[PDB]
Amino acid sequence: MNLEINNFAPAISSIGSQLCSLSAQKLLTCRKQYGNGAKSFEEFYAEIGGIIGMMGINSQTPSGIREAIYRLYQSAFLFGDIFPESFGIQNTQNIKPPPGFTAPAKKLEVVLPQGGAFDLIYNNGEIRVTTTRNVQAGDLVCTVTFPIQGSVIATRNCHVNEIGGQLTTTRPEIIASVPMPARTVIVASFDAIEIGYGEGDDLFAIGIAILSNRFNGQITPMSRHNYMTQMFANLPANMSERDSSAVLHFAQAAPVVLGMMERLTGAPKWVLDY
Amino acid sequence: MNLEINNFAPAISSIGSQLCSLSAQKLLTCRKQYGNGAKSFEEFYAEIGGIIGMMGINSQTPSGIREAIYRLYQSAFLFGDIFPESFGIQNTQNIKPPPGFTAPAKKLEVVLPQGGAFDLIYNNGEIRVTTTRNVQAGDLVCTVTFPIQGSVIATRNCHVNEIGGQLTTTRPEIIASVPMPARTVIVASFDAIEIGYGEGDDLFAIGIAILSNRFNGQITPMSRHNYMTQMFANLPANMSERDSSAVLHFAQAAPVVLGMMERLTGAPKWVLDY
Amino acid sequence: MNLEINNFAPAISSIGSQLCSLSAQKLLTCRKQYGNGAKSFEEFYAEIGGIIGMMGINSQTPSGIREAIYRLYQSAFLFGDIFPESFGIQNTQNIKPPPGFTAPAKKLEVVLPQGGAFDLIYNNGEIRVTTTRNVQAGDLVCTVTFPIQGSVIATRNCHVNEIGGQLTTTRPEIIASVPMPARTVIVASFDAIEIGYGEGDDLFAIGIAILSNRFNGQITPMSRHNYMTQMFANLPANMSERDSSAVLHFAQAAPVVLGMMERLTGAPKWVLDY
Amino acid sequence: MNLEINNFAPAISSIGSQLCSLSAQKLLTCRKQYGNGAKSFEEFYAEIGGIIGMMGINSQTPSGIREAIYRLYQSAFLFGDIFPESFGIQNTQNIKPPPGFTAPAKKLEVVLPQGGAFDLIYNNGEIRVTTTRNVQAGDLVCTVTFPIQGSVIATRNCHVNEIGGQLTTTRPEIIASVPMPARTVIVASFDAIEIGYGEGDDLFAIGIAILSNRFNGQITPMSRHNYMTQMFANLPANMSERDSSAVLHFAQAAPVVLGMMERLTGAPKWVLDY
Amino acid sequence: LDRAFLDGVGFTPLAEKQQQLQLQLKTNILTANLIRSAINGMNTESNLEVAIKMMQAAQLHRASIEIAFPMNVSLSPEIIVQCFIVWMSIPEQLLSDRSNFIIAAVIWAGFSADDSYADIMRRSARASDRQNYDIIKAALSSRKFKLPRASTTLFDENEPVVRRYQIGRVYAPFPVDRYGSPVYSNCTKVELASDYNAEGFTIRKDDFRALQAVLRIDEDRAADMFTTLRIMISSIPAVWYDAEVVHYPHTAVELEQLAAYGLTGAYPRTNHSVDTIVKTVNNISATYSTIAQMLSTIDLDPTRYGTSESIDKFKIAWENVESVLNMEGNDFVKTIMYAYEDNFPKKDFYMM
Amino acid sequence: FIIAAVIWAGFSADDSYADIMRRSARASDRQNYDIIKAALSSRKFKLPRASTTLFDENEPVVRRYQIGRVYAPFPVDRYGSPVYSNCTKVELASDYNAEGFTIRKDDFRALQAVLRIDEDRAADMFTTLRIMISSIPAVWYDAEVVHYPHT
């Protein structure tokens, strides 16, 4: 995908996340009070599920909500810098923190240094390397570029900076402890969490196609993990980690809510409880 | 485990799931409003456990809800396929979609193509087979018989139809991509979601015996994975995915609610948000 | 970590869990009623979110809740002989059951019996040992100490007491089935749930440090798994399975709530739905 | 650390220092009249420790002062050169003088001439170098990059400009005075005062963590001396001593006050009497 | 403001309603019917107070009406008929959750095959009233029972005037749309499988149809029914719509008064213009600005005597404020402040 | 304990006044009071309890004897805020029905409102307490009741 994130993304992502949360709450409220099976549930929702009051949005139909998320997503991610005042946010710094990430880090990105000393095999939740030549102990073998946090389990022939089983650093650096010659293998498994959210995986698949049909020149369908990795890698350099979470929440919440508005199922906790 | 699914099962499940969800909501409210005293929480619940507003059913008492669950389960899943006139089972033309599946796929079920040219062993989320003899590249070597959807990681000497990391089909088929000699090991790890729900596993464990002691000749205690696989495999071929979702939801919601009424703990979200 | 859990622990733990649940409910209620304006979210929460009225908490600020958590934690788990007579501890005749555990069992604890005949390594979901000499069929090779509950998948060259896919005992043991040569490898994977919960691990990291800075000589920061294993190992032998659940619920609810009051994000479902 | 200081830093610092002094004076005022009853001092401070009449502050609780300090620090020292219209800045030229520095210069900062001619080792208050090769009298040996004022004691085999034992220039240079061969050693001790305020070092350590948990991308925990050396190195060249003094005073007062609002001990004199 | 600027009420006299119900009822005059005998003991006294509270509940979504029911455990024909009238004539967006749940349970206790009012009250919890109300409404909106539940919509129209503040939108205190047709949350049709029976009290199936027929508001008053709503929308600031409730008795009305108000189709009426209301609001704002300016130029000091000051120092600080409040042009705020000192004390007012 | 029992007789679902009065045998007065007080500060019921703290402010004066701290008879704080042991606002989700005597739940809010203490009232109370605490000899504060009628 091709896109650049404006330097005022969090102030727009806050409004987008609030809109998505209100949409999800309205959907659940309509779900609970649906008691007559004569009318299709789609018809009942299309009748009263679009009436939501907020600054900027002035529509009483789901189509207006869809255009609202479309415009917010476009302003925040596809185009260049746009000032937050256009959407009428009163204050830029007064943004409510988003829920913490709960996505399991099954696949873990690592970058080997130059020289091709090691080979990389990814398994379910760990990484193995095979050493093709002689290596002295005390040198980096791997480094993690995708921020990660959690415990460490089943480390063999390697050392990582940690105390009590908890990783001290977000980006760990795996090093050797004892010299191992003649085509060895070392592992480093982690019981950690990544930078996305785990629930609503199907809804993301349904909504990513919906919002890629519109911005076909910028957005393409793919998996949630790759989408999150590219969005994280495309963030501006001068941005605190407190404000990156705000934009990363909306980046994943928009496809999920777009898909959810089609298949009127439940909503994930990280979307509704914002 | 033998069980016969009638063609009116979705209509029955439409009411069974509603009954289960309403019972769960009442328990959470009572648990919040309970003040510790001389009376036990179990005695406190028996008095105010019963739901209201459901005509044609006995539910003014917890035992009544348990008996209704028994009757609905028998009418929907057992060989006694008789539709109760207590509710309007004949109609129920339009139902509410159930929540999406959340159970992780750790032991995914597969079938060998023909006779036996491989040695298959399961793993935490992956399967690996070793070829006994030489096999050409471009022929089917494995196929999943249990529907699955999600991402794919660690593709070694195989190929799966997927774009952007997301599996194209519900039933992926594994095909070797390189001419491989004997004892070569191909693997396939899936970060995907199977059919069923992963929460409330203990509640299911206690609840399955509750209705196994009643239907001794039909239901036996077993794991959630095996129960879900058998229930899916016993469904009629001529049924829509949307229509079978209600049956699959209720088939797991009944045991977990039965166990929930015994162990007065919390209820899973998917039961509540129906 | 040095700590002595007394007989009076369940009475303290019930009050602690109730206080934590009330704090979480207030946090979410004030998080839904926040309108963006001149005041930041933390100022808004400080003014109204803190107010909670129970016996023994004497403040309408979060500092009162923090001090109450500190006092209850010190009374229940710390070495000093302290009991808070000011709370609603006198009427703790009946205790509401805590929610069931949901923590995945990734690193499960086992103990090789004797003789150094087996070498142990761990994996994401499975364990495996190498026999250094001949072994007879039907003898004990490993046994678990941390209780688990769930299904068993992908067992090779061994046997466990399981019927229908479900383990019959909370402390399964693995025994070899056939006399096997040296260098043979036996494996056993489990899709089970260990003690404690899984959600809220980000809050645990920043709460354990908070409550370790106060009791600087008694508690050392470390991961949730080691914390829970030590808490379970320090439980007295003469305790029921119902009171230990409440004790272990409070032992994790205290740090996560302490960390939640710092980062004003959401709250875990198990903390809130007590 | 990475941080950019704008041309209007003195204006922000003159407000931040006043806010810090106000908060400290209020802390002592409330500390003098503590009732010593059932409520702890933390609840007492959280109840009555706020400022009600300052433009810029939007809450009467301590959290308001904390949030104002966060805003002022971010505006003055971080990447965002945002001018805070919320606090009232009328004249950017008027600046009350800050108190003089009190930090003893123990680890004095010096740089070698780049000829690779001397070895540098440190002591409590003196530096001493050993000649690697032959050196003639009357050439540079060392020079200080961190400005220092005070007296000079125990000057051996070197010369510094001095009048009555007092240093003349704020950046003295050490030049050898005698032809000294054969790897001799020269010493230079200073009874002087560096930049910053020695008092209240305990509060700085606890407050730097508080403000680094928020601006983690720009600020990291470290000692006071290194923090002040980097802060002084990042000052613009077009800056007088009257303004840099205010900038540095606020730069040290902000962490000290942030850590003082947590550990409710006293406040240093240089913070109170600003 | 609502009480001062709403000096009338546009109801219809009860005699015509009684005659209409007698004409619609298909029952012999000699036979005694309890639905008929219950509206003969009602009066339109205090319709004005109920109208003011209806308008306040429409403007403020937090000041929902709380109904005071004389019953505790048992029922009565008057209670049943009044609950039905409230159900079919008062929109639910202007009633609190408990008020909705009580009347819903009273309705359901007669149509339920085995449930009784005492059991519903004992088993239910006041905390979950909205859920139970939703379930009961869904049950009563099914294909076996159908009772239309009155509702209302938001309005944006406004009369042009010069004002310094923005306005919003409020619900209507009546159940009709701009077109003039009654509004119902569910179906507009009444059909029931069986009768209504709770204790010994019984109602025929055609009695409810007759009651629905008589509860139709007059189309003619539509022009007068909306001018008051227009001037109320166009003269009240929008930022006040999220205000809390401080005096409980302002939102409390008993069941008989509400039933009499809803039976006659009353609506608030007024004879004042838009500019007087905005002038009063401007006066209130001017008083607040005067007090704020005085405090800023005399009392605004952060260095000493703030939160820690003893209660003995409040006499000196308050003297200037109560001196300012005693000049000309500040009588509205002074009256409101002195009248409700118990609910909003002087210290919180001073801090604000 | 008796005040608490009379109050709780009308809020408990099952126990009557006699049933609560019977609890004297399997407990103490203090413990039963604690139980009922905890029952009145739960999620279902919230009845604020008047409380007071120790007072230590005295105006200096030359005197021969010793001085001590005394509780403040009034339940308002030095800064004018009310002091309550359990909760600051009455919020009870039921009605008081005991032996056929009933009070609507909305009357308790009015009763709390009418019992509020104004500012000059609290100023006068503290003015009298400050002069009373700084002059009465404190050696007799450990006295034992002799003429019961006085208590």
In whole angstroms, what is the distance from residue A24 CA to residue A253 CA?
A: 11
Place of tokens 């830029």: A92
Output the CA–CA distances (angstroms, integers) from residue B20 to B28, B32, B258, E137, in the order listed. 13, 19, 9, 19
> What is the Cα–Cα distance from D9 to D17, expressed in whole angstroms?
12
E strand or H helix that includes residue C256: helix C241-260
How far apart CA E338 and CA E342 sit, in angstroms, is: 9
Q: Is E127 within 8 Å of F93 when comparing Cβ atoms?
A: yes
C-alpha of C159 from chain center: 29
Q: In what order do the strands lie in the sheet with D118-122?
A: D118-122, D126-131, D185-193, D149-156, D166-167, D162-163
Cα-Cα end-to-end distance for chain B: 28
- Is residue B32 within 8 Å of residue B39, measured between CB atoms? no
Half-sphere exposure of E270 (CA within 13 A, CB side): 22
Q: E143 — contact with chain F (CB < 8 Å)?
A: no
Closest residue by Cα to residue E258 from E72, E69, E110: E69
- Residues of D numbered 41-80 whose beta carbons fall under 8 angstroms of chain C's beta carbons: which are they? 42-43, 45-47, 58-59, 61-64, 66-67
Q: Are C4 and C240 in contact (CB under 8 A)?
A: no
Q: How many CB atoms lie within 10 A of CB B160?
A: 15
| Count of residues in chain F | 151
Residue of A151, A155, A245 best to disrupt the C interface, most CBs of C under 10 A:
A151
Task: Give the whole-angstrom CA distance, residue E98 versus residue E113.
Answer: 23
Instruction: Please report all neighbours of B, defined by 3+ CB atom pairs within 8 A.
Output: A, C, E, F
Q: Which two tokens stand for residue E70?
A: 């004389």
Burial call A157-180: b when 16+ CB within 10 Å, e when fewer: bbebebeebbbeeeebebbbeeeb
Which DSSP helix (H) or strand (E) runs through E261? helix E255-263
Q: Which residues of E touch B32 (CB under 8 A)?
A: 127
Helix (H) and strand (E) counts in chain F: 5, 4
Which of A91, A235, A240 best tests the D interface by mutation, with the highest count of D CBs <10 A?
A: A240
Q: How far is CA D37 from the centre of its chain?
A: 38
CA distance, residue F150 to nearest chain E CA (Å): 32
Give the N- to C-terminal CA distance of chain C in Å, as an integer: 27
Asked if F17 and F98 touch (Cβ cutoff 8 Å), the reply is: yes
Q: Which amino acid is at C25?
A: Q
CB contact under 8 A, D48 and F79: yes
Distance, CA of E33 to CA of E22 (rounded, Å): 11
The answer to whether the Cβ–Cβ distance between B273 and A28 falls below 8 Å is yes
**In this structure, what token pair is assigned to residue D236?**
């613009």
Task: Give helix B62-77 / helix B9-33 axis angle, nearest 10°.
Answer: 160
The residue type found at F97 is: N
Q: How is chain B split among helix, strand and coil, in percent rounded to 5?
A: 35, 15, 50
D216–chain A Cβ distance below 8 A for any pair: yes
Chain-chain contact of B191 with A122 (C-beta, under 8 angstroms): no
3-state helix, strand, coil split of chain A in percent (to 5) is: 40, 15, 45
Using the Cα atoms of residue A246, residue A252, residue A255 and residue A257 in order, give the sign of their dihedral: negative
Contacts of D62 in chain C (CB under 8 A): 46
The answer to whether F114 faces chain E, any CB pair under 8 Å, is yes
CB-CB: which of B102, B153, B193 is closest to A106?
A: B153
State the smallest CA–CA distance between residue C12 and chain D in angstroms.
20
Closest CA to B52 of C36, A168, E132: E132
Contacts of F among chains (3+ CB pairs under 8 A)? B, C, D, E
Beta strands E252-254 and E66-68 are: parallel
- CA–CA separation, B269 and B273 (whole Å): 6
Task: Write down the experimental method used for this entry.
Answer: cryo-EM
> How close, in Å, is residue F146 to chain C by CA atoms?
31
Q: Which region holds residue A42: left if phi is over 0, alpha if psi is between -120 and 50, else beta?
A: alpha
CB proximity list for B3: less than 8 A, separation 6 or greater: B77, B78, B79, B218, B219, B230, B231, B234
Query: Which one of F14, F39, F43 has the shortest CB-CB distance to B32?
Result: F43
Q: What phi, psi does B191 have (nearest 5°)?
A: -100, 75
Resolution number, Å: 3.1
Burial class of residue E95 (count of CB atoms within 10 Å of its CB; 0-12, 13-18, 19+): buried
CA separation, residue D112 to residues B18, C36, C137, D141 (Å): 81, 55, 74, 7
Query: What is the rounded CA–CA span in Å between residue C133 and residue F15?
Result: 71
Cβ E193 vs Cβ E145: under 8 Å: yes
Chain D positions touching F78 (Cβ under 8 A) are: 35
CB D110 within 8 Å of CB D50: no
Q: Is D32 on the interface with F (CB under 8 A)?
A: no
- Selected for mutation to probe chain B from A107, A128, A228 (highest B CB count within 10 Å) is A107
CA distance B249 to B274: 9
F41 vs C53: CB contact, 8 Å cut-off?
yes
Strand, coil or helix: A104: strand
Tell me how close the Cα of D31 comes to any Cα of chain F, in angstroms: 15
- Which residue among C40, C202, C225 places its CB closest to the CB of A94? C40
Distance of CA E250 to the CA centre of its chain: 10
Q: Which of B50, B54, B55 is opposite residue E123, by nearest beta carbon? A: B50
Residues of D in Cβ contact (< 8 Å) with E301 = 53
Q: How far, in Å, CA of A93 to CA of C36, rounded?
A: 10
3-state class (DSSP) for residue D144: strand
C-beta separation of C37 from C54 below 8 A: no
Give buried/exposed letters for E202-239 (b at 16+ CB in 10 A, else e).
ebeeebbbbbbebbebeeebeeebbebbebbbbbbeee
What is d(CA C89, CA C12) in angstroms, rounded to the nearest whole number?
7
What is residue D57's three-state secondary structure?
coil
Touch criterion met for B and C (3+ Cβ pairs within 8 Å): yes
Tell me the C-alpha distance between B167 and E103, whole Å: 54
Whether residues D217 and A241 touch (CB distance < 8 A) is answered with yes
Q: What's the start-to-end Cα distance of chain E, in Å?
A: 21
Phi, psi angles (nearest 5°) of residue A46: -60, -20
Residue in C119, B123, B157 with CA at minimum distance from that of residue A126: B123
Rounded to a whole number of angstroms, the distance from the CA of C150 to the nearest CA of chain D is: 39
**Which residue in A94, A101, A154 is closest to C122 by CB distance?**
A154
Residue tagged 């019917």 (tokens): E33
> Using a CB-CB distance cutoff of 8 angstroms, which residues of chain D are in contact with residue C69?
none
Cα three-residue angle E45-E50-E55, rounded to 5 degrees: 150
Name the token pair of D15: 């407000």
Residues followed by a break in chain E (C to N exceeding 2.5 Å) are: none
Give the residue from C114, C123, C105, C180 showing the smallest Cα distance to C141.
C114
Q: Which of D255, D225, D244 is nearest to D70 (CA)?
A: D255
User: Is the Cβ of C244 closer than 8 Å to some Cβ of chain B?
Assistant: no
- Tell whether A85 is within 8 A of chain C (Cβ): no
Cβ-based burial of D157 (10 A; exposed 0-12, middle 13-18, buried ≥19)? middle
Minimum-distance CB partner of C53 among F34, F35, F46? F46
Question: In the 8-state DSSP scheme, what is residue F26?
Answer: T
